[PDB]
Amino acid sequence: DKKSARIRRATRARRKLQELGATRLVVHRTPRHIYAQVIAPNGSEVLVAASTVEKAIAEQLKYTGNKDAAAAVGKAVAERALEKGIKDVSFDRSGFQYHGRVQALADAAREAGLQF
Amino acid sequence: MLQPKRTKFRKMHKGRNRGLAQGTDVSFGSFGLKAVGRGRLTARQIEAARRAMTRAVKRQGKIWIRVFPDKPITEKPLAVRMGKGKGNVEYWVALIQPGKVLYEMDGVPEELAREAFKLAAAKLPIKTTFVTKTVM
Amino acid sequence: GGSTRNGRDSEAKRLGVKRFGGESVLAGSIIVRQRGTKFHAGANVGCGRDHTLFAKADGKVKFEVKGPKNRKFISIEAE
Amino acid sequence: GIREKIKLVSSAGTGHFYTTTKNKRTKPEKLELKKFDPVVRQHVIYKEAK
Amino acid sequence: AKLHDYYKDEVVKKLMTEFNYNSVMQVPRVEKITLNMGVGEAIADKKLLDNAAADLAAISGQKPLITKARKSVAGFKIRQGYPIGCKVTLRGERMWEFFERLITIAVPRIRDFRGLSAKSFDGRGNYSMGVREQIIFPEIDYDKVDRVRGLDITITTTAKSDEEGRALLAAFDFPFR
RNA sequence: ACUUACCAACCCGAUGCAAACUGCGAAUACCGGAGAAUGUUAUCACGGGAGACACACGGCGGGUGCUAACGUCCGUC
RNA sequence: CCUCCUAAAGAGUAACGGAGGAGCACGAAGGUUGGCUAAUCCUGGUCGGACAUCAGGAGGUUAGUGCAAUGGCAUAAGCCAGCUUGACUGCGAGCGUGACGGCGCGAGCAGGUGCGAAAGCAGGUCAUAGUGAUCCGGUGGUUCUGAAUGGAAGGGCCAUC
RNA sequence: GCCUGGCGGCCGUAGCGCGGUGGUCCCACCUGACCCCAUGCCGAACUCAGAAGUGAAACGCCGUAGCGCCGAUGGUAGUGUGGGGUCUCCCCAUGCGAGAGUAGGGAACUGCCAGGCA
Ligand SMILES: [Mg+2]
Ligand SMILES: [Mg+2]
Ligand SMILES: [Mg+2]
Ligand SMILES: [Mg+2]
Ligand SMILES: [Mg+2]
Ligand SMILES: [Mg+2]
Ligand SMILES: [Mg+2]
Ligand SMILES: [Mg+2]
Ligand SMILES: [Mg+2]
Ligand SMILES: [Mg+2]
Ligand SMILES: [Mg+2]
16 A cells, blocks of 8 residues: 555564663654654653654754655754753654654764764 | 265264254245254165155255265174274264155145155154254 | 274373463464464463464463454463 | 585694585585684684585 | 656646646546457467567566466467466566557557557556557567567556546557548 | 456355353352261271172263164263 | 364374475574565556556455474565674573483673674574484594603594594 | 543453544645665555645544344253153253353543644
């Protein structure tokens, strides 16, 4: 289906991350936007988040959702999370390949101080 | 005459024949010939009966046989010994328990129907009895 | 046509059960031919090469049932 | 069963070797591939395979 | 391009008014063109296939993907996983270019020619026709040929009905009866 | 291409059958935890000494046989 | 020796009871990362048909799994590709299952290695058949031993036939 | 408060079907493609750069009982114990008590974070 596809692509990892019980950094992408969330291991509550859909992170990006944009969100959730002392996490591509705008944001996360 | 055209296995166990019948009331014709006994009609029986039944009404009517063999039944030959492998399927039986409705019949005056059923009955190894359609 | 012959024993089936002081790592449930009959859950998993469910850490045996439509699952709660 | 017992041997000194088998026919080329050598406690090229 | 262009300027125009769709999106569009050979005889002429393939290559922009036998069956003498045909999926520029050299200069070279059929529709606005002997394609060197072969293209479109599908190709010169 | 008081799968509705069917599903049995009464510890371990490894009928659930056998083979009392 | 029923919803359970398989295969048919998803029917399409390949639509695991049966498998255990050799050595809390000989499952620790950005996975293969104790003897390694002493022969130990 | 997106809980009273409805924003299709990166062929998918167009498709929401699903009561089946018979099967006392069907329910419920308009 496409969104259907992505999910089963996404499912194994997710599950192995739940098995392992680990606050996970969850990325999600869209033609126009890129979002990131740091989600407690219980799976049901998010500690930190950031995304190009927030007035700020955006009010100074050429375009939302592109390699550059991503980066901003990365470094965003990165700091925000570090703010709350959330260090150490596991990246969750959620079906998207680890490569695109996704790799930035990811990379930006590290270069911010996030552990993974 | 009458039996599975094919069978996942060649031979059945033997089991037992407890419990009341399941196909229990006239649901195709206007009259039935219900079991009322426990036991097993064999192929040559369901037929012998069927025949009698038929040649009786003559041309007319419709007939339905609700039971059907599908049960192997073997027989160790004569002067052979005990044991050396299970015997050979010799004929087929349908297990029938009290309540089983055996035949149904259709395009015929009550009377004749009974008449016919009385005749087919006398070919059966189990006691039986005549049933009418019933609204519910 | 020359019938007979049979595998043997194999045992198999649940061996621990219910709450139960499942020790450090007991083979509680060994219905191999499964990794399916029962599924690796909570602080018990491994599920060994023959689909055998075992205690990954000592506690009480669980048995639950999740949402890929039923689907069994045995786990180990702390006692 | 037709398939032969090969014997992979440590490239290092060590009289060490793993022991297996190959279908000598379909796979005529002396089988090589790395494995752990315990006397030298290192991963060395093991060779030899019919 | 070209034909693609002809599609937007005129055509969608045509089809919108034919059927007054609410949304332009609702207007049928040629999705892809998947032309396939199907050697059948590579089971004996392993080399015949390579020919066919290189043929589809010539005719169509680029590299033909060879198809195995989905499953083995004794009727036609074929083992499962047997190279027994090759195909090509066309999209964007290359799909249009061939949609044109197709009706523009090749469908014409067909025998005597007297029109394609407009009943060759799967029931959901998708075409399908045969060519029985390529050659009609200039890209093939007649003096270098090795057999008549012939392929078969089928046009897959977003039409919901043959009614519509027809109208679509109907609006490119596209021959027909 | 049509046809034919030929047979006709699948599909739909209606009706049954299954040890080697099951989108249901008991009674019991078995496993675990606590608890009380009650039992010449009936439990477990280790050690001394054994005998026994031809069983029979009866009830219940079955296989085999003919739901034959004071038959035959298992379960359980 | 393996799968099913007989077997009475824990295990186990007999018969010259009912049915079938094994005595192998694979250096990829193992590992991992990334990816993908059958069968069957209707319809349209050169040669091409009832049935080879192409398209669409229903379908949704009835397909597939080297191989019997059963139980599993979509997070796939099915299908493909890149890089590989964890088909690693030493061990092993703690379980199973056996009268016994023994067989089996196992996280975790040490060294060292592959895949992956990472979390991480890997001590063969969806699992359960694919096997032969002891003796004697051979081959490699190892001063452990070595009949006055030094050696040697032979013996031990580890691997293996 | 309405709307949307993301991550879960529960895992069909949560689904399918028919009807209706939404695009400022979010989603989606969409545009472009030398390039990152991709096609055992194909920018379909994966992907990057975008935003002229549309909410057709898909997606969400609202309605709707055709089907799915859930589902009593009462009876029936079986069955532990104790008795009994006309013992291939059955009955009585007592305890447990289905499956199917019937009436009926049903067009989910719910938590964290964010974004849009009020
Ligand atoms: Mg004592
Ligand atoms: Mg004896
Ligand atoms: Mg004896
Ligand atoms: Mg006895
Ligand atoms: Mg006796
Ligand atoms: Mg049992
Ligand atoms: Mg039992
Ligand atoms: Mg056809
Ligand atoms: Mg709708
Ligand atoms: Mg719409
Ligand atoms: Mg009920």
